[PDB]
Curated annotation (Swiss-Prot), chain C:
Residue ranges annotated for the RdRp catalytic domain, each copy included: 1-108
Shown residues within the full chain: 5059 to 5321 of 7096
Coiled-coil regions listed: none
Gene symbol of the encoding locus: rep
Active site feature: S93, D94, D95
Domain of life the protein comes from: Viruses
Name recorded for this polypeptide: RNA-directed RNA polymerase nsp12
Swiss-Prot record, chain D:
Notes on how activity is controlled: Inhibited by Remdesivir antiviral drug (GS-5734).
Region feature (GpppA-binding): 412-426
Binding site for Zn(2+) 15: H255, C259, H262, C277
Function according to Swiss-Prot or TrEMBL: Plays a role in viral RNA synthesis through two distinct activities. The N7-guanine methyltransferase activity plays a role in the formation of the cap structure GpppA-RNA. The proofreading exoribonuclease reduces the sensitivity of the virus to RNA mutagens during replication. This activity acts on both ssRNA and dsRNA in a 3'-5' direction.
Species this chain originates from: Severe acute respiratory syndrome coronavirus 2 (2019-nCoV)
Compartments, record wording: Host cytoplasm; Host endoplasmic reticulum
Source organism, top-level taxon: Viruses
Protein name: Guanine-N7 methyltransferase nsp14
Sequence ranges assigned to domain ExoN in this UniProt record: 70-285
Entry annotation: catalytic residues: D88, E90, E189, H266, D271
Length: 131, 113, 263, 523, 133
């Protein structure tokens, strides 16, 4: 019964990251040694008009960024492991995320590395009003 | 209260095919009530698409039975190799009781999705 | 009773130190067993009884219990024989084992555990919890425990005999904890290790694996003790013993002799 | 295609709101417009749903530079015996709020330990995932009925993983510095090892120096085997797949071929023991290799020196006692004389003749069935060879397989697998073999001068007061010392005791007697 | 048998010995455990005593009126009042023998289990008055 969920092109990555002790560094070492990034993420459809703020309640892209199903970007939420947020749940479960179309091939890697500036609400570098 | 089928239906592999001669060789899975008057078979289980005839020698092995078959039953049992489609073949003209008995034995014996 | 340093008054019950404890306990045990059988047979419906002879037994039992007034030797005789055929007992002091018909018991013609519970309740003023009353169906492996020994069915020589084997934690505890500081130093006392090994022997036939290792550990200990003893003796004074005949203590036929019926 | 990995098992039929659906295949289809997703504000996100997530089919065969392999080859496993531990698990199916997955229930290892754990699984919530307790039931198989009572005797998992770390730690602290699990139905065991395993780059212990094999989640620190109390994760196990090695049916029928010892009491540890027994057979019951080495753990070199001394002495004594014409050596692959000078004719036999010295080392596989009536001249010498009943003339030295020590490890089938340097496998021990011989009684033969000062004979050689009746070393009469002989006797007695406590047993032809050594002594 | 001791529970709660919520105090029936069960049982002594007194009165009247018949337990309500003369017979008055063997013989253990005669120790068998000196 049930419903299948992952395509065979993700088995090694998901296993090796669900057994590791530091999921983040594990995934970074995986990529950094010739790995194929994760890839059945849910992809949205919208207007590419609105705030550049990736974290949002409703797909709000610009002509450059690209809306994604948030929950399917938190690696922690993807491998079914616990989150390092001291308390106590992932935030990207419920929202949408918008990633620069350039780097928006690997969503999980970006979500791991970059962060939104608290002021401009946008990615530090893509872009930020601060300084 | 009332129990339905204190059941002794073991399993055999035998012959079956699309026509009386298309009954080739060892590819059928028969459930058999080995009654008083010989081994009486009830249902046939295979992965082959559809087969109109099974071919099993008599209780004395003289003639090979020419038994036309039900339209196969569709269901997806599972094994370590994931899903596995199988087809259940009833001998056409079977009362509800033997249907129920065969279904009980099979479903309690083999896992489905 | 002179407990502490003052005299009290013992209300009742035995004082388990007099001249005849084990035997009086055996008598009391048989009494309770017979009482339970009687209650079982009398508290069952008559019409449900199939056999005519058994309705005759129950009927005349009610007779000889309440209607009659003095003894009737033949009834006692045939009832005692009935019990000896469908209840067979083995009694050491307050410690019993019963080999009984099973279908009779199911029908209610002899006593099962529930009857013992009821009898103890109204005639002993205690509640026998059912977590302490074992039960066995297959007669190969024997009684589940008797006199704090377990039974195992082992093929010895050319036939299949029963053997008793203790509880391993008990033997190890006995090995580690003593009650005098000269019972420590194994050098002086190897004899008690011999006795302990004699008690531990039948473990060797156990299908498990730590269990046999208990016995083999004891043997190797004895060897170690003898070696260090000769060493010490040669050390303090220079003599070496002339003859020992102790080598038969660390070799496993001296022990298995004890469970071979020919003495 | 798809896999069974992370296959959902919830009974509800509706897909998930894309913003809380882990993948593009586990979304619902109203949002599925041409493989893409469109948010339909007519429906909101659920705020209560609990979907169990099956955890089977893990498939781990990666290549990262900082991380060590988890499945090792056959040679890397042969090298690291001492560290093998069987493993088997029993299962249970999920019932009401989900169906289609198994949960670990009873665990069993090569040691006779059996742990039971309450059924727990990985559940989701609108905010996160969750490790919680779920309801289950045993398999409908009849032979699995001995599992019905176990479903109410479980333990919370943390207790179980702590107990596991502790059991391993005090089984292996004195042998290896790792652990390799031998297993059969590889998949489900790998599934179960999600509960208490954690992998990652190689690390060294804290407050000790050996490689670290434990993890603590609370304090976040590692440990070796010795200093691991309160830690609850194995940090880098290794594995092995016995059935991968080209085997056919269930391991029951396969094991049943050779070992008639390990029966099947219906648990899991039984399967573990059978698996390890089989793995030992497949790699060790052959002929012994001489290229494989092992570290010493420990004290072993004393046992070796003792074996040297005792061999030299016993053979010299037997020769000088009976003066055999020919010495039929047996089982010696290197034609090296034990006693260095001996006028007796000295053969060499073996079932493995080397290249050189093959002209010396005649090929010979002994068996009393046949060669019983062949070497009826002189005497044989079965040093550590393993045959059936020995001929009535011989000087056998055979390792008893019943002793306990950390050197010999259980093998098949009842015979154990000694490990000193190169692992020797010896068959089971029995008495029928020695039906022609008798235990060598202890003694000590010397033949040399004495103390000195005197350097002559009666009576100017230094005497101290040793009174023992078995040091057959004239000069000796009760004062029997000549210092030299005395402390030599002490040394050799110590060595003999150590050797024979290590496990080895001695035997001699029935004709032996000590007196004729005295008769030799009279000069 | 603690698996189905329901009728007993009903008697105890009916005659105000203890009250229902007690029976969830697990191990209520045990003797070594929870010794208050002795008091709870003892609360039936007075009623058991009244039963015996009334049995004596009936035996008196039955001998006086010249009647013969076996007395049994299951013909007496828990107030002592008898009934059910099924197979009594007739004789000259003042010459009727009531049979009381099975009755007393079966009743016996309950007398000490429920501490029946504890009324006898009072100043005049009257539970309110002090103890005899
Ligand atoms: Mg089993
Ligand atoms: Mg199993
Ligand atoms: Zn998350
Ligand atoms: Zn900003
Ligand atoms: Zn450490």
């Amino acid at each position: 019964a049930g419903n299948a969920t992952e395509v065979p092109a993700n088995s090694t990555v998901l296993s090796f990251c669900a057994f590791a002790v530091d999921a983040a560094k594990a995934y970074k070492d995986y990529l950094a040694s010739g790995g194929q990034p994760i890839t059945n993420c849910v992809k949205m459809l919208c207007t590419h008009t609105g705030t550049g703020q990736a974290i949002t309640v409703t797909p709000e892209a610009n002509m450059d960024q690209e809306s994604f199903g948030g929950a399917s970007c938190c690696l922690y939420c993807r491998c079914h492991i616990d989150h390092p947020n001291p308390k106590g749940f992932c935030d990207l479960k419920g929202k949408y995320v918008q990633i620069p179309t350039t780097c928006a091939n690997d969503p999980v890697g970006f979500t791991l590395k970059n962060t939104v500036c608290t002021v401009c609400g946008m990615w530090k570098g893509y872009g930020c009003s601060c300084d | 209260n009332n129990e339905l089928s204190p059941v002794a239906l073991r399993q055999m592999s035998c012959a079956a095919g699309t026509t009386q001669t298309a009954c080739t060789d060892d590819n059928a899975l028969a459930y058999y009530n080995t009654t008083k008057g010989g081994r009486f078979v009830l249902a046939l289980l295979s992965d082959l698409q559809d087969l109109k005839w099974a071919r099993f020698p008599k209780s004395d092995g003289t003639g090979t039975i020419y038994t036309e078959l039900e339209p196969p039953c569709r269901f997806v049992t599972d094994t370590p190799k994931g899903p596995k489609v199988k087809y259940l073949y009833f001998i056409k003209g079977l009362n509800n009781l033997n249907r129920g008995m065969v279904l009980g034995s099979l479903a309690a014996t083999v896992r489905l999705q | 009773v002179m407990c502490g340093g003052s005299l009290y008054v013992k209300p009742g019950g035995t004082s388990s130190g007099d001249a005849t404890t084990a035997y009086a306990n055996s008598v009391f045990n048989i009494c309770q067993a017979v009482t339970a059988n009687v209650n079982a047979l009398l508290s069952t419906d008559g019409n449900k009884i199939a056999d005519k002879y058994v309705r005759n037994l129950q009927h005349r039992l009610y007779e000889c219990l309440y209607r009659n007034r003095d003894v009737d030797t033949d009834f006692v005789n045939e009832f005692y024989a009935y019990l000896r055929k469908h209840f067979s007992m083995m009694i050491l002091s307050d410690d019993a084992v019963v080999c009984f018909n099973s279908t009779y018991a199911s029908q209610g013609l002899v006593a099962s555990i529930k009857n013992f519970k009821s009898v103890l309740y109204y005639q002993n003023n205690v509640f026998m919890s059912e977590a302490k009353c074992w039960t066995e169906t297959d007669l190969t492996k024997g009684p589940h425990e008797f006199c704090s020994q377990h039974t195992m069915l082992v093929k010895q020589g050319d036939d299949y005999v029963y053997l008793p084997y203790p509880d391993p934690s008990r033997i190890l505890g006995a090995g580690c904890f003593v009650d005098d500081i000269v019972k420590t130093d194994g050098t002086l006392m190897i004899e008690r290790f011999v006795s302990l090994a004699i008690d531990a022997y039948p473990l060797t036939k156990h299908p498990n694996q730590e269990y046999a290792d208990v016995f083999h550990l004891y043997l190797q200990y004895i060897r170690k003790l003898h070696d260090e003893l000769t060493g010490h003796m040669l050390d303090m004074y220079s003599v070496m013993l002339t003859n020992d005949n102790t080598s038969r203590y660390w070799e496993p036929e001296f022990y298995e002799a004890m469970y071979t019926p020919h003495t | 295609n798809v896999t069974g990995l992370f296959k959902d098992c919830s009974k509800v039929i509706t897909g998930l709101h894309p913003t809380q659906a882990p993948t593009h295949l586990s979304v619902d289809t109203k949002f599925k417009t041409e493989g893409l997703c469109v948010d339909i504000p007519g429906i909101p996100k659920d705020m209560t749903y609990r979907r169990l997530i099956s955890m089977m089919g893990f498939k781990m065969n990666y290549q990262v530079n900082g991380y060590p392999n988890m499945f090792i080859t056959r040679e890397e496993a042969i090298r690291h015996v001492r560290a093998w531990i069987g493993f088997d698990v029993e299962g249970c199916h999920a019932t009401r709020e989900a169906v289609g997955t198994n949960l670990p229930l009873q665990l069993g290892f090569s040691t006779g330990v059996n742990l039971v754990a309450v059924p727990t699984g990985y559940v989701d919530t609108p905010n996160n995932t969750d490790f919680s307790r779920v309801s289950a039931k045993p398999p409908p198989g009849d032979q699995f009925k001995h599992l019905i009572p176990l479903m109410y005797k479980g333990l919370p998992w943390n207790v179980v993983r702590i107990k596991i770390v502790q059991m391993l730690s005090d089984t292996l602290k004195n042998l290896s510095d790792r652990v390799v699990f031998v297993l059969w139905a590889h998949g489900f065991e790998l599934t179960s090892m999600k509960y208490f395993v954690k992998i990652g780059p190689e690390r060294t212990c804290c407050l000790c120096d050996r490689r670290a094999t434990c993890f603590s989640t609370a304090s976040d620190t590692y440990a070796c085997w010795h200093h691991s109390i309160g830690f609850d994760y194995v940090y880098n196990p290794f594995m092995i797949d016995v059935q991968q090695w080209g085997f056919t049916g269930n391991l029951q029928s396969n094991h049943d071929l050779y070992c008639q010892v390990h029966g099947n009491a219906h648990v899991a540890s039984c399967d573990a023991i059978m698996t390890r027994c089989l793995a030992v057979h497949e790699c060790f019951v052959k002929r012994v290799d001489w290229t494989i080495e092992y570290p010493i753990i420990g004290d072993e070199l004393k046992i070796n020196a003792a074996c040297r001394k005792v061999q030299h002495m016993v053979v010299k004594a037997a020769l000088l006692a009976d003066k055999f014409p020919v010495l039929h050596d047996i089982g010696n692959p290197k034609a090296i004389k034990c006693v260095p000078q001996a006028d007796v004719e000295w053969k060499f036999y073996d079932a493995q003749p080397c290249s050189d010295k093959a002209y010396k080392i005649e090929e010979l596989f002994y068996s009393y069935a046949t060669h019983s009536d062949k070497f009826t001249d002189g005497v044989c010498l079965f040093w550590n060879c393993n045959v059936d009943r020995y001929p009535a003339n011989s000087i056998v030295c055979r390792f008893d397989t019943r002793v306990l020590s950390n050197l010999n490890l259980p093998g098949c089938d009842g015979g154990s697998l000694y490990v000193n340097k190169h692992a020797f496998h010896t068959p089971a021990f029995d008495k029928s073999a020695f039906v022609n011989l008798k235990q060598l009684p202890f003694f000590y033969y010397s033949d040399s001068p004495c103390e000195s000062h005197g350097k002559q004979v009666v009576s100017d050689i230094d005497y101290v007061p040793l009174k023992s009746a078995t040091c057959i070393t004239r000069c000796n009469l009760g004062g029997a010392v000549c210092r030299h002989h005395a402390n030599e006797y002490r040394l050799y007695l110590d060595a003999y005791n150590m050797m024979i406590s290590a496990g080895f047993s001695l035997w001699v032809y029935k004709q032996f007697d000590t007196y004729n050594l005295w008769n030799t002594f009279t000069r | 048998d603690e698996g189905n001791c329901d009728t007993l529970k009903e008697i105890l709660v009916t005659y105000n010995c203890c009250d229902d919520d007690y029976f969830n105090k697990k191990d209520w029936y045990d003797f070594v455990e929870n010794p208050d069960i002795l008091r709870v049982y003892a609360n039936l002594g007075e009623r058991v005593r009244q039963a015996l007194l009334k049995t004596v009165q009936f035996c008196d009247a039955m001998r006086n009126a010249g009647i013969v018949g076996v007395l049994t337990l299951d013909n007496q309500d828990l107030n002592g009042n008898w009934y059910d003369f099924g197979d009594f017979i007739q004789t000259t008055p003042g010459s009727g023998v009531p049979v009381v063997d099975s009755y007393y013989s079966l009743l016996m253990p309950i007398l000490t289990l429920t501490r029946a005669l504890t009324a006898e120790s009072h100043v005049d068998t009257d539970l309110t008055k002090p103890y005899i000196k």
